[PDB]
Write a protein that binds this ligand. Structure first.
Ligand code: SAH
Lengths: 265, 265
């Protein structure tokens, strides 16, 4: 009679909360989805071993089209868990699944976990200064999406930071790198000429948040565009005007050039 | 030797991540602060029992003025952990403490935990649509803080949602309720008259996120301003223009007036 939406956290199998783990262990059936994002620091096998339960992974179609036929039926007479990377309901489509549960007469509860949306706090940038967020999508064919460029423009204009989620091919396990994202942004700039993203733009790269050894780097595009930030996943942030304390953290912790203390504050 | 900044999560002792718990259990000394937020579903005793270590609680003064005298010295010859509610670097000034750690020759690591900043996804509002955040501070003496009003104004004009962290005076055991925040906002509106926060404004209240049954309510200020949302902590959200799916969730899950389904495109 109960469905639990449980977040797996940021990077590996230990990023689930104690609450999430204990609840998952007591569930009769455990499902999971790895299409909104992936858990790069672990494997389904390691997650299954930790939870001590077999996990049925669902595709995007299984969820969007058949959630009420695959998951909810079992939730009617059993305790069922639905695992998702990060924090449940951060992904935009997740929320509506609770409505489906309600329609099916199934109670649902949410067990939170760390999300990249909040983990960016480790960049030293003040959380309240982050504005609207966006996703940098790979262009393909004659389709060249550029809405994320306008998001940066509008946030930066108001002195706000922009969190950019990077594209991912869940099935093919292909992750867009911060390097690729920077190249794309320079390409959009060359097309729009808005003076929003150039070689002189200060950026912050956060790779493998959740890991004990994430890569946190800050610097100008001209210097970071070909830098190796390590294995995925990567997150790109375009800061707005910096508070001196934010800048000092970027210099001391993220190896940012001293120049940012006079140019971006 | 090492210093770990470990988040404890949203509501109770089990909101810590498995990673955080396994590391905390092996540390030589464990410190913590409980003034940046309120964990309404646990006690110091329960946290100590879970980690199996005595926790020395520090006051705001101990941390801001003496972190380098109380915590860092021990981290030079031992494994030390510093615990905080929610995520340690979200809506706190703790990031700067990593700079102090470095200057003292102490390596630091960060272990994330669920944060209210991302938990608001449970309201059904799209996380990417949240703009700049703000804090509603208690007026004191003859000074009445009003910056948060301008934040809502700026976000709303852009169709973005506004997360409003509410004030806390941990030593006085004072936790601002959503009701008190609404009363303050109405007073600022009477002054600035920007049509930003009125009795007809739609708002969302999230209380005790992290618990299994948090209070999630949406409706007009005139109807919610005197409603009992239960024990603290509370956060107030002023949505911008809603997507149909957001409206549907607010109606189905947060009890919002069915009339909000009819969005004005
Ligand atoms: N479980 C919870 N439910 C509702 N609001 C919460 C909350 N935890 C924190 N808050 C809100 O956030 C304020 C503290 S701000 C510190 C936040 C913390 N670092 C985190 O990551 O969550 C509180 O005064 C309250 O308004």
């Amino acid at each position: 009679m109960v469905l639990y939406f449980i977040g797996l956290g940021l990077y590996d199998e230990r990023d689930i909360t104690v609450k999430g783990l204990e609840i998952a262990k007591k569930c009769d059936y455990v499902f999971a989805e790895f299409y909104t994002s992936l858990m790069a620091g672990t494997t389904l096998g390691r997650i299954q071993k930790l939870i001590g339960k077999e996990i049925r992974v669902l595709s995007r179609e299984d969820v969007e089209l058949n959630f009420e036929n695959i998951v909810l039926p079992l939730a009617k007479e059993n305790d069922v868990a639905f695992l998702t990377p990060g924090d449940p309901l951060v992904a935009t489509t997740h929320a509506e699944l609770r409505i489906r549960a309600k329609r099916a007469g199934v109670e649902s509860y949410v067990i939170h976990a760390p999300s990249i949306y909040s983990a960016v706090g480790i960049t030293g940038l003040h959380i309240y200064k982050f504005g609207k967020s966006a996703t940098v999508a790979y262009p393909e064919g004659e389709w060249f999406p550029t809405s994320y460029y306008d998001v940066i423009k509008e946030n930066a204009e108001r002195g706000l930071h922009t969190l950019l989620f990077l594209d991912i091919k869940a099935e093919k396990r292909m992750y867009m790198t911060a390097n690729e994202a920077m190249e794309l942004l320079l390409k959009v700039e060359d097309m729009k000429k808005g003076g929003v993203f150039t070689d002189d733009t200060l950026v912050v790269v956060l790779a493998r948040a959740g890991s004990l050894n994430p890569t946190i780097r800050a610097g100008y595009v001209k210097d970071l565009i070909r830098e190796d930030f390590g294995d995925p996943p990567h997150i790109l942030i375009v800061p707005g005007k910096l508070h001196i304390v934010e800048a000092e953290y970027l210099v001391e912790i993220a190896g940012a050039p001293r120049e940012i203390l006079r140019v971006n504050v």
